[PDB]
Nucleic acid binder design. Structure first.
Ligand SMILES: [Mg+2]
Ligand SMILES: [Mg+2]
Ligand SMILES: [Mg+2]
Ligand SMILES: [Mg+2]
Ligand SMILES: [Mg+2]
Ligand SMILES: [Mg+2]
Ligand SMILES: [Mg+2]
Ligand SMILES: [Mg+2]
Ligand SMILES: [Mg+2]
Ligand SMILES: [Mg+2]
Ligand SMILES: [Mg+2]
Ligand SMILES: [Mg+2]
Ligand SMILES: [Mg+2]
Ligand SMILES: [Mg+2]
Ligand SMILES: [Mg+2]
Ligand SMILES: [Mg+2]
Ligand SMILES: [Mg+2]
Ligand SMILES: [Mg+2]
Ligand SMILES: [Mg+2]
Ligand SMILES: [Mg+2]
Ligand SMILES: [Mg+2]
Ligand SMILES: [Mg+2]
Ligand SMILES: [Mg+2]
Ligand SMILES: [Mg+2]
Ligand SMILES: [Mg+2]
Ligand SMILES: [Mg+2]
Ligand SMILES: [Mg+2]
Ligand SMILES: [Mg+2]
Ligand SMILES: [Mg+2]
Ligand SMILES: [Mg+2]
Ligand SMILES: [Mg+2]
Lengths: 102, 209, 202, 53
RNA sequence: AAAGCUCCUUCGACGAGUCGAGUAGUUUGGGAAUGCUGCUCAAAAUGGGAGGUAAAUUUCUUCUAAAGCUAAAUACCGGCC
RNA sequence: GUUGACCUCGGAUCAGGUAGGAGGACCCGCUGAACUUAAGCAUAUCAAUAAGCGGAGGAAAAGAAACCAACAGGGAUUGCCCUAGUAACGGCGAGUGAAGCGGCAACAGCUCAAAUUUGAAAGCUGGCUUCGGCCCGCGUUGUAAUUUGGAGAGGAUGCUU
């Protein structure tokens, strides 16, 4: 029972009165969840393969440098603002782990 | 070249329309073919009904929202409530749809009853005559009058709600305090100003702090 | 197993390990013929994902194409037409380079059937592909029901009829409001919208 | 060829009245196969790995 | 030997020079760009696509792409009747 | 050194097989005009059509959702009636122009990649055979069983098939 409908149309919460129910979650909706089997593989390959040239330019510019430039440059490569934000956040993690470890 | 008071014409007849004209002189000939195919199919399925069972479904748009009709198949939750295995359903004339869900409880309850009484009316012949099994018909009531359409015998009983109802006086309810017409105007303007009102209230809390 | 890691490694085509390995292979190629047999697939994980199996009757071929854009073939530059369609230089072909690679292989091996193809390498003037073929007359193929559907006489030369994976992309074979004019066949629907139907009792 | 003798040996016992795994013992062999080996080391069951060059 | 149903703490692998973006030509009723193709750049894990006006911030609905198969209702007098 | 394997590349009138041509009314793709209309004419229109080229069948193609929707929610594909000469496009000129819902015809659903059989490649082409099987080869850079999101795996539990 998420929300109760008012019972008259043309309103903030319009609808027809009915008894809504909660239903079991379908397996098709588990697409994006992380798995411990795929996190293990993706971590090992990153160690073997290394980084890419465009990441190496951002990661250097992200530390001791501008932050607006790190997002203007990231958007121009990846192509969209949403992906640029996530990539900058992810690269910020690796530098935090690197220097602060030892 | 218009000459008099005319309606401006728009006749899409500038391509080579004559190459694609589909006259229908085989309307009665085709009908005979279908009737020969139906009775041939009914002969192959000797004791079985021709059609398959369908559930009750409501139309999806605000217009046509009132009426109901037949659907494609029963949801996996409807079959479970009536105690029918998933794999056995398609093989005894029941149609199953695996991509439909039961958001409400009115639709779920209506279909379960519509499917439960069908199970009581079913006669199930054994796979081998000499060795019957527990779920088979015990051969005593195998002889009875049967139906074959299953679309007229199991169609929608009534698609629309009753036209009117008659109730005694002094049972008539009282309307909304403001009135019916003004209740709509207030509800309309409340949704228009939901954003303006919300930020003004919120910024006041931060302004005083 | 190991095939999962190969999927992850092949995703990073800009890393130093992969980039070196692509540069050396592309030189090994381009010294052989344009079309030639391959002993075994060079991308075992990618081929496996598309239906390849390691049993008799399955073969792999590879081919390269010129990697450009179509130039209208006319005597000199004259077209003898209205100005709206007298351009010669910036026109484009309506089928992918992947499709042309599959089609030339089909003429070379006229007794086999094409299953799929995938990208292997590319250059400044070439793009390389590997094509999976199946023998429809082998006994080991007709015995297995997961693949013997291809032996039917309706799957003949489906390379140039537009029935492989890349053929379905070049056509608008998808559902939705976006693929309206080509959902069931572009030319079929144009006939439907342009026919004039008359019944007996008008 | 060795597998044939063991399989025939099992048939005589199962007809005689002795069930399987009563005439044979647990085998100890070297493992092989890329996918098979990769799984073994992920579970820390392997003790030594040899790789071709 | 093999198969079906009812319950659960926990697990639950899912397709890459692809999706997407910029630019060029063609095409569509598709209009700050509907589909297709060439070149340059090139992804992610509750992620990703779509929600018919370009953009940022915050919510919501709905499906699961980049591998494959399959009868009937439909077209046609060219071939044999 | 001798000798025996492995990988890649070849010879043969080697053993056994397979493709071309015709037809092309209907069907799946590529390529691609101008006459004509606008009372001239260049974007537009004729037209995503004629000619040219490649590939199939008795039907072909399509198809079990990265869909439609905004509802009290519909539920693979194809065709007919309606939506509709409508939303929209257009020297906004001449002209062009779909889709969802709704009634009916016909109805049917499925297997692969990504998991170690690991207490036993359990799988297959070919040759010989008295018909019971044997021999070489393919294959561990993965052939059967098991799983396909509707789930499923691993555990519980008593009946049934
Ligand atoms: Mg081989
Ligand atoms: Mg070219
Ligand atoms: Mg010309
Ligand atoms: Mg033009
Ligand atoms: Mg013109
Ligand atoms: Mg598809
Ligand atoms: Mg009239
Ligand atoms: Mg997928
Ligand atoms: Mg693309
Ligand atoms: Mg063109
Ligand atoms: Mg465009
Ligand atoms: Mg098909
Ligand atoms: Mg010979
Ligand atoms: Mg020969
Ligand atoms: Mg021919
Ligand atoms: Mg004319
Ligand atoms: Mg004129
Ligand atoms: Mg004139
Ligand atoms: Mg003139
Ligand atoms: Mg045009
Ligand atoms: Mg023609
Ligand atoms: Mg037919
Ligand atoms: Mg077909
Ligand atoms: Mg599915
Ligand atoms: Mg829905
Ligand atoms: Mg439908
Ligand atoms: Mg236009
Ligand atoms: Mg037109
Ligand atoms: Mg309909
Ligand atoms: Mg044999
Ligand atoms: Mg099972």
């Amino acid at each position: 029972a998420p929300v109760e409908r008012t019972g008259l149309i043309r309103g903030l919460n319009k609808g027809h009165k009915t008894t809504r129910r909660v239903l079991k979650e379908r397996p098709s909706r588990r697409k994006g969840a992380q798995s411990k089997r795929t996190q293990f593989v993706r971590s090992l390959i990153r160690e073997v393969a290394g980084l890419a040239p465009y990441e190496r330019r951002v990661i250097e510019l992200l530390r001791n440098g501008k932050d607006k430039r790190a997002r203007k440059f990231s958007k121009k490569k990846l192509g969209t603002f949403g992906r640029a934000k996530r990539k900058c956040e992810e690269l910020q993690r690796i530098i935090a782990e690197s220097r602060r470890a030892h | 070249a218009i000459k008099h008071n005319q309606q401006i014409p728009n006749n899409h007849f500038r391509k080579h329309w004559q190459r694609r004209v589909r006259c229908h002189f085989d309307q009665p000939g085709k009908k005979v073919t279908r009737r020969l195919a139906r009775r041939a199919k009914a002969a192959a399925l000797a004791p079985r009904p021709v059609d398959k069972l369908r559930p009750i479904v409501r139309c999806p748009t605000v217009k046509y929202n009132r009426r109901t009709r037949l659907g494609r198949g029963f949801t996996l939750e409807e079959l479970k409530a009536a105690g029918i295995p998933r794999l056995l359903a398609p093989t005894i004339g029941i149609a199953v749809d695996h991509r439909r869900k039961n958001l409400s409880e009115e639709s779920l309850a209506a279909n379960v009853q519509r499917l439960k009484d069908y199970k009581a009316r079913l006669i199930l012949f054994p796979r081998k005559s000499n060795k019957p099994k527990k779920a088979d018909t015990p051969k005593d009531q195998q002889t009875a009058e049967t139906t074959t359409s299953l679309r007229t015998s199991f169609g929608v009983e009534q698609p629309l709600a009753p036209g009117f109802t008659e109730i005694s006086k002094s049972e008539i309810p009282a309307g909304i305090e403001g009135g019916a017409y003004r209740a709509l105007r207030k509800a309309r303007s409340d949704a228009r100003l939901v954003g303006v009102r919300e930020k003004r209230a919120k910024e006041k809390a931060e302004a005083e702090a | 197993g190991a095939l999962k890691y190969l999927e992850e490694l092949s995703k990073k085509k800009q890393s130093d390990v992969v980039r070196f390995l692509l540069r050396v292979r592309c030189w090994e190629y381009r010294q052989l013929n344009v079309i030639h047999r391959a002993s075994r697939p060079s991308r075992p994980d990618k081929a496996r994902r598309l239906g390849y199996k390691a049993k008799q009757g399955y073969v792999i071929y590879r081919v390269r194409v010129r990697r450009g854009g179509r130039k209208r073939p006319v005597p000199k530059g004259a077209t003898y037409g209205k100005p709206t369609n007298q351009g010669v230089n910036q026109l484009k072909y309506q089928r992918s380079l992947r499709a042309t690679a599959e089609e030339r292989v089909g003429r070379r091996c006229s007794n086999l059937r094409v299953l799929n193809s995938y990208w292997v390498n590319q250059d400044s003037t070439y793009k390389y592909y590997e094509v999976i073929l199946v023998d429809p007359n082998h006994k080991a193929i007709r015995r297995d029901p997961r693949i013997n559907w291809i032996c039917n006489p309706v799957h003949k030369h489906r390379e140039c009829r537009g029935l492989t994976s890349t053929g379905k992309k070049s056509r608008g074979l998808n559902k939705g409001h976006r693929f309206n004019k080509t959902r069931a066949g572009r030319r079929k629907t144009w006939k439907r919208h342009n026919t004039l139907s008359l019944w007996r009792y008008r | 060829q060795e597998k044939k003798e063991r399989l025939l040996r099992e048939a005589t016992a199962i007809k005689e009245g002795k069930k399987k795994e009563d005439v044979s013992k647990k085998p100890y062999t070297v493992k092989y196969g890329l996918n098979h080996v990769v799984g073994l080391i992920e579970n820390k069951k392997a003790s030594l790995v040899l790789i071709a060059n």
